[PDB]
C-alpha cells in the first residue's frame with residue numbers, strides 16, 4: 001500500500017522526470033516490445049519499427065496518464081476510471097503484461113536518472129506502478 | 142467481483158461439499174504438492190508423504206477457512222483478516238502459489254462433484270477462489 | 283520435457299479412454315465461460331452471451347474437436363513438442379495475435395474437464411503427469427513468438 | 429538458450445566492464461529493499477531494517493559478490509546453464525527452501541542495476557539480450573526442484 005513516504009518519493013522522482021516523461025514513455029514501450037515479444041500481440045495495428053511515430057505518440061499518452069496518477073495518487077481509481085474500463089474490459093490485457101511494462105519503466109528511469117534512483121525511490125516507484133497496474137486490471141470479471 | 146448469482150452458486154456447491162470439506166482440502170493439498178513441487182518449499186517442516194496425517198490435518202484447516210469465507214461472503218476482507226496477516230506478512234507466500242492451490246481445489250471438486258460442476262458453477266467457484274486469494278495476498282508490502 | 287516412463291504410460295493410458303469430440307467441445311466451451319476475456323478471439327462463432335449459448339454452440343464444439351486433435355498429435359510426439367507445434371505457434375502469433383498466457387488457461391481448464399469426466403480415476407499422480415504435459419504444450423505453442 | 433551471436437557478444441562486451449563488487453552488493457541490496465519479503469532468507473545477515481542498513485551491510489555486500497560470480501560462470505557456459513547451476517539448484521531447493529519465483533525478482537533487480545550503472549550504453553537491444561540471460565538463469569536454478 002502506498003505510504004506517505006512512498007507518495008513523497010514518487011512525487012519527487014516524477015517531478016524530476018518533468019518534461020522528459022514522454023520520451024521515457026516511448027523508450028519504455030520500445031524496451032518492452034524488444035525484451036518481451038509477446039506484448040506485441042496487443043498492438044498488431046501498430047507500426048512497431050524502431051523510431052516508429054506510432055510508438056512515440058503512444059509513449060506520450062502513457063507518460064501523461066502516469067503524470068495524472070501521480071497528481072491523483074490518493075484517488076487513483078476515480079482518476080483512472082476511463083483507462084481501467086479500456087484495459088480491463090475493451091482490450092482485455094492479461095495482468096502479467098503490466099509487470100513487464102512496469103519493469104521496463106523502472107529500467108528507463110534507472111538509465112536516465114541515476115542520482116535519483118536510490119534504493120528507497122526504486123522501492124517506492126515499484127509499489128506505485130503495481131498500484132496503477134491493479135487499478136487498470138481490476139474490473140476484469 | 143462476485144455477482145448475486147455467483148454467491149448463490151458458491152453457497153450451493155459448498156453446501157453439497159458438506160462434511161467432506163476437510164477431505165477435499167487434504168486432497169487439494171496433495172495434488173498441489175505433486176503437480177507443483179515448488180510449493181513444498183513453504184512446508185519444509187511437514188511430512189508430505191502420501192497419506193500424511195499432517196497434510197490431512199492441514200487440509201481441514203484450509204477447508205474450514207473457506208467455509209468461513211463462504212459464511213461471510215459479503216465481508217471477506219475482514220473475515221479473513223487474521224489469515225491475511227499470516228499469509229502475506231509472516232509466511233510471505235508468493236501470489237502465484239495461490240493460483241496453483243485454487244486450480245487444485247477446482248480439480249478436486251470436479252472429480253468428486255460431477256453433477257454440481259457445471260460450467261456456470263465452475264465460473265463462480267473460480268471467481269470466488271480468486272477473491273479469496275486476493276484478500277490473503279492483499280497486504281503484500 | 284521431464285516425463286518418466288511411468289508418467290508417459292499414465293498419460294497415454296488415460297488418453298485412450300477419452301472421447302476427443304466431446305472433451306474438446308467441453309474444454310473450449312468452459313474456457314470461454316470461465317475466462318470470458320478469451321471470447322474476443324472468437325467473434326465469428328456467434329452468440330456467446332450465456333453459458334448455454336456457449337456450451338451448445340456448434341462452432342464451439344467443432345473448433346474444440348480441432349484443438350483436441352492437435353493435442354492428440356502432441357501426445358504421440360512427446361519427445362518433440364516444439365517441432366510438432368511449430369507451424370501452429372507461428373499461426374497463433376502472426377495471424378491470430380493471441381497472448382500465450384491464454385495457452386495456460388486452456389491447459390488448466392482441460393485438466394479440470396478430465397477430472398470431471400474420469401472422477402476418482404484422475405488421481406494426484408495422473409494429474410501431475412497431465413500438468414507437465416499441458417505446460418509442455420503451452421511452451422511449445424509459445425516458442426515461435428517473435 | 430535462444431541467444432544470437434550478436435546478442436552473446438552484446439552481453440559479453442558489457443559484462444567485461446562490470447565492477448563485480450559494486451554491482452553485486454547493489455543487486456542483492458536492492459532485492460532486500462524493494463522486495464522485503466526476501467529478507468526472510470537472510471535473517472542470519474543481521475541488521476536489515478532500513479535501506480541504509482541493508483546497503484551498508486558487509487555480509488550483504490559480500491554475498492552479492494558471490495551471486496555475481498555464479499552469474500559469471502553462466503555467461504561463460506551459456507549453452508549449458510542447466511548443467512552449470514545444477515548443484516546450486518539443489519542447494520536452493522533442499523537446504524534453503526527458496527521459492528523459485530524469487531529468482532525472477534533478482535534477475536530483474538539485476539537488470540535495473542545494470543541500467544543504473546551503464547546509462548546510455550544499456551540500450552533496448554542490450555537489455556533484451558540480458559533479459560533472455562536472466563530468464564535462462566532463473567530457469568536453470570529451478571530445474572532440480574523436486
Ligand code: HEM
Pocket residue numbers: 039042043061062065066083086087091093097098101132133136
Ligand atoms: C502503467 C500501465 C499502463 C498505462 C498507464 C497505460 C496507458 C494507456 C493509455 C493512456 C492509452 C490510451 C487510451 C486513450 O486514448 O484514452 C492506452 C491505450 C492502450 N494500451 Fe495501455 N497502459 C498501460 C499498460 C498497458 C499494457 C501492459 C498493455 C499491453 C501489453 C497496454 C496495451 C494498450 C493498447 C493496445 C492500447 C490501445 C492502443 C491504440 O490502439 O490506440 N497498455 N494505454
Ligand code: HEM
Pocket residue numbers: 180183184202203206207224227228232234238239242273274277
Ligand atoms: C485458499 C487459499 C488458502 C487458504 C484458505 C489457507 C488457509 C490456511 C490456514 C487456515 C492456515 C492455518 C493458520 C493457523 O495455523 O491458524 C494456513 C497456514 C499455512 N498456509 Fe495456507 N491457505 C491458503 C493458501 C496457501 C498457500 C498458497 C500456501 C503456500 C503454497 C500456503 C502455505 C501455508 C503455510 C506454510 C501455513 C503454515 C503451516 C504451519 O506451519 O502450520 N497456504 N493457511
Ligand code: HEM
Pocket residue numbers: 320323324326348349350352353370373374378380384385388419423
Ligand atoms: C492446446 C492449445 C491450443 C491448440 C492445440 C490450438 C490448436 C488450434 C488449431 C488447430 C487451430 C486451427 C488453425 C487454423 O485455422 O489453421 C486453432 C485456430 C485458432 N485458435 Fe487455437 N489452439 C490452442 C489454444 C488457443 C487459445 C488459448 C486461443 C485463444 C484464447 C486460441 C485461439 C484460436 C483462434 C482465434 C483460431 C482461429 C479460429 C477461427 O477459425 O476463426 N487457440 N488453434
Ligand code: HEM
Pocket residue numbers: 466469470472494495498499516520524526530531534535565566569
Ligand atoms: C540468479 C539467482 C541466484 C543465484 C545465481 C544465486 C547464487 C547463490 C550462491 C552462489 C550462493 C552461495 C552458495 C554456496 O555457498 O555454495 C547462494 C547462497 C544463498 N542464496 Fe542464492 N542465488 C540466487 C537467487 C537467490 C534468491 C532469490 C534467494 C532468496 C530470495 C537466495 C537466497 C540464498 C540464501 C539464503 C543462500 C545461503 C546464504 C548463506 O550462506 O547464509 N538466492 N546463492
